[PDB]
Amino acid sequence: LKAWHLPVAPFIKEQQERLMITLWLSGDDLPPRVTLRAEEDNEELSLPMHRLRQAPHPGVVAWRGEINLVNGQPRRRYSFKLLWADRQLWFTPQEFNRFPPARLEQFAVDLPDSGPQWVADQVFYQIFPDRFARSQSRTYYHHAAGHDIVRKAWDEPLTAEAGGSTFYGGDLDGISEKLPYLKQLGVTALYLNPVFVAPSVHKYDTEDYRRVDPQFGGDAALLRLRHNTQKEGMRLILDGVFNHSGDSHAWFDRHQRGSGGACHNADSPWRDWYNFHDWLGYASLPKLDYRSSTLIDEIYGGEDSVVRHWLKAPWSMDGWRLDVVHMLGEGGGARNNLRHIAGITQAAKLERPDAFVFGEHFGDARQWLQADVEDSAMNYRGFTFPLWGFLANTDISYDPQKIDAQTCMAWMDNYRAGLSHQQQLRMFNQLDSHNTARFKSLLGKDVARLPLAVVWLFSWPGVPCIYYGDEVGVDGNNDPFCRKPFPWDPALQDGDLLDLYKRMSKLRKAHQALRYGGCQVIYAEDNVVVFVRVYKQQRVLVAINRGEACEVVIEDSPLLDVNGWQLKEGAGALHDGVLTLPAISASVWFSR
Amino acid sequence: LKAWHLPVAPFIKEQQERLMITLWLSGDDLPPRVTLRAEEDNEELSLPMHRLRQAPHPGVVAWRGEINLVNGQPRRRYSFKLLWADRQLWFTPQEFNRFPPARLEQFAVDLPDSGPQWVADQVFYQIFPDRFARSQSRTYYHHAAGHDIVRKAWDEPLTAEAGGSTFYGGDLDGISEKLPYLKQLGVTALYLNPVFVAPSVHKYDTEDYRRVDPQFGGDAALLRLRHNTQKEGMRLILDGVFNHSGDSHAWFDRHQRGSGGACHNADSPWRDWYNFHDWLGYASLPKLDYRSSTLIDEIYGGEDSVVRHWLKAPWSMDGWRLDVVHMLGEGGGARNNLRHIAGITQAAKLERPDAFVFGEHFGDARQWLQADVEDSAMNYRGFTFPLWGFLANTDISYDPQKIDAQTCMAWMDNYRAGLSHQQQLRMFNQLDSHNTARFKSLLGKDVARLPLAVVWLFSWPGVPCIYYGDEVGVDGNNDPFCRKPFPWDPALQDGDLLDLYKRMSKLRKAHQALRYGGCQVIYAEDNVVVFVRVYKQQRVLVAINRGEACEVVIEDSPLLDVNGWQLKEGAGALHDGVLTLPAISASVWFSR
């Protein structure tokens, strides 16, 4: 028995106020009945399906039913109940199921889709401002550190000493001046590490949420960057650090810069915004207690709360990346975390309907996402760590990892199963960031697998994000060594890798299936993954081989039943259902 | 490689402000390291484990770590990360996992447990009042029906005609007078179908939430029932119907009994409590719109809201069973359903800390339960439907079902995995109710399997509930035929089945493991399920065989490493790791 369904055309079709669902079957003992199990206001429905007279592909039977769109919540969950005289069988995002699937792991499609529909069209670039680029025009005491800040020149090797107080001096006009490079790279969107006033070099120790830090060029340099990105048709996302403030913030004020700080005044106007508690034992980052209704008003509840402030004119940012999104809450811990993250997102959409709000989740984010308290997550669990395992033999803890393609794809498809198709397309996929080792370093001896990850990064459902300098081969161990200054000297740049990034953003820009398509894994065994993106009549086929050269047979699939295959990247070759794959390669084909 | 862990003594032990966790391993290639992966405020922790010098059982290595209880939310989630030089492996509630388990399918234990700790000690009995018993002392027009109500005598066969308007005349004093029978049966707790003023016989079409219906004996008969249950040390749960009112309710008033009803007055004081919408097309049950802040105040927000009213003196009920818990919400559908169900539960605990609030869930309730918006669910997905499938070859839709023991237990263990141990113990398990066919009828030709379900009902983690008359062999198809009058004539009673129920409540009352224990499935193949309940040093072993007689080998398990086994029910025999099981039997052993 075989089945196929993806939550996208040609399997679904919205028509007037109905959602038509089509299922494909093939095999020797087909169910005489099939029920469309679909949810309407959490109530499970048994919707009849009827056989289509016309076979869509050789040897394949189509069944068709409809969901009524006039009622029910926007998220349409559904799966397929196959019925014989004596037994049943479920068809799900995770293949066949002998017992009923989890309600929250069915196919799902958001109609109407109220999410940020622009995210799927983007290519994101993450910038640690101090380390990217100095503008052409181009010291104090760090109280949380034990010393004055250190200023190095752009060519000085990074060291472990005073990592959080060493400034190489990149700024926001330097990003503006580098916009032509980013457009050449294919970037359409920037995510910036924190830029607000804060004594550290990374600036997650926020002192003033209302003012850009002078060291990066100040308010005027951020306004300019907003003007220039808008002019280049580029999106801008700022780092939203709301779980905790900095201890030099006027609200807390460990160092007595004022007289009303909460750290040294039981009568402080902000005494209740704190607990007398931080972010895992770090005295420079006192945690904010969202039990206080005035704190809620200051961060998101109020009209000029911080979340909304940087979203309305003149700042008009396109959204927020939420630092430590999972621990934010009341009473010193995560109590009522979900409610508050929803509040933040809700306030953002109030100020800007298409605001993109996504959270940093190193863990399993499905509960946040499955309750719509945010649009997306930095997809470490659904994308990054599977690749660290399959390609790099390691994980978040730098514990060894021995997973084959079956496990890797079970892992990846299991995670997506909890997500609607619209959610899957705007998941924030990346290979590393300011918080991790450079993926290139993590490969160790298998660094030649790095182009494979780059191709995968652009073809797996979700929006891709480059950590600055990945494109030119920057490496380094974890924080502080993953924040090397960007090498603008092309002699210190991997030009081939740079061109791979450039072409992948071109493929993605060229082909709707890489931006809007469903995704069906087609072969996953040992060293070889093969999946296809699928959208209307177009198909994009992707074949990844992490090991020695090999040949792999590809059974006839009605998904792969096209005119022909145009090779667009990589050295693989497909002929008569035979994939010839060179060692350590990735290939992409379009359908003709 | 083998592993064992249950979220209960002897594997866990609370000590000062630490939660000690012990893992058992056995095999040829044991990991030299094991990490306790445990969550603290959603942040994943890697807690070292250390090998215990003393082997707990032959051939078995124990690892021990600790969770710090002083911080973090009350629900302590955790799993086990096994580490070799080159690879890792996860040990979970669902066995080994090659990729990381879902955060919400780890082991979990609520410390402190703020739930209703009495629920686990209970045996529940569900009564459809009109059909249970008439008190010794012992017609109008039904506007939603098309006719006057019909009154039949206790011996008249039930018919499909006017099912919702036919009254056999049972009342609440009749329950009071039958308390000795229920105590003899082993019942400690009653769940009553709706009793408030309503024209129908089932009374889910509520007309007045503040008054008991005269037909059942009125307010005074419910007060008496509250007095008598309290006197007998029995708990009382009323049916909470808050998704919708009745169309004869003063708020709606389809039949113009007043002048300010919302049905025929745009200016009605309750116009916004409705939508101009019901419960799936039924005109007698107009759905309540929880967008209205005054409605929220009337049902649960206010001090004398309905939810709280029947919980404070003189009514002092022990909680609420929530009818249609999954569809309640705003704007005519389920919008913001989770928030409102939490509000209901929250208001209940405000009035009574140990209030039991659980919802009728015919579907997958894990999202409600995993966010603590209710204490428990009528466990159709985790208990009832697995047994309808494995034992009765059918399901909610009366579609055929061909599942073996492997699938049945995968199904049951998968569902529990999403639930903490405390949640699992108070899940509301039953075999049928007013909304379903009688389980006895559902067995068709395999009715001899019925004692198997009864034993299972009392030994699977969760609180068991008898639908009135199941104990004496009542059968019948679905509504209206599942509401036969109870046969008090012992000549029309299955006395053997009655005695099976009586002994099972005795076993459960006798043995802590049947009320507080973990549960490990030990063998599950074809016709045979074998699981053990586990608590401190005691073990209760349960062996179910739905088919012909057979023998089954039971590998040595350190869980089954006890002095000896005392057979307490059934005709099975265990000797030298050999289970001899008679056809269509269930057996229970205690450890000596």
Secondary-structure map:
The structure is a homodimer of 592-residue chains.
Chain A lengths: L1 E3 L7 E4 L2 E9 L6 E8 L2 E6 L1 E2 L9 E8 L6 E9 L4 E5 L2 E3 L9 E4 L13 E4 L13 E2 L4 E2 L1 E2 L14 E2 L4 H14 L3 E4 L3 E2 L10 E5 L5 H14 L3 E7 L51 H9 L4 H4 L9 E5 L13 H15 L4 E6 L4 H5 L5 E4 H13 L12 H13 L3 H5 L2 E2 L9 H4 L7 H10 L3 E5 L27 H16 L2 H4 L1 E8 L2 E8 L2 E8 L4 E4 L11 E5 L3 E3 L2 E4 L3 E7 L1
Helix pairs in contact in A: 1-2, 3-5, 7-8, 11-12
PDB class: hydrolase
Keywords: Hydrolase
Assembly: dimeric
Tell me what the structure shows.
Chains A, B: This is Maltodextrin glucosidase. 2 copies of one chain form a homodimer. Chain A is of the alpha+beta class. Among the domains of chain A are: 2-110, Sandwich (Immunoglobulin-like); 518-591, Sandwich (Immunoglobulin-like). The first copy, chain A, is 21% helix and 27% strand. The first copy, chain A, contains 13 helices and 33 strands. Chain A has an 8-stranded parallel sheet with strand order 23-22-21-20-17-12-25-24. In chain A, strands 4, 5, 8, 9, 10 and 11 form a 6-stranded antiparallel sheet that branches. In chain A, strands 1, 2, 3, 6 and 7 form a 5-stranded antiparallel sheet that branches. The radius of gyration of chain A is 25 Å and the shape is globular. The two termini of chain A are 29 Å apart. Chains A and B meet through strand 5, helix 6, helix 7 and helix 8 of A and strand 5, helix 6, helix 7 and helix 8 of B.
Short recap of the structure:
The structure is a homodimer of 592-residue chains. Chain A has 592 residues and is α+β, with helices and mostly antiparallel strands.
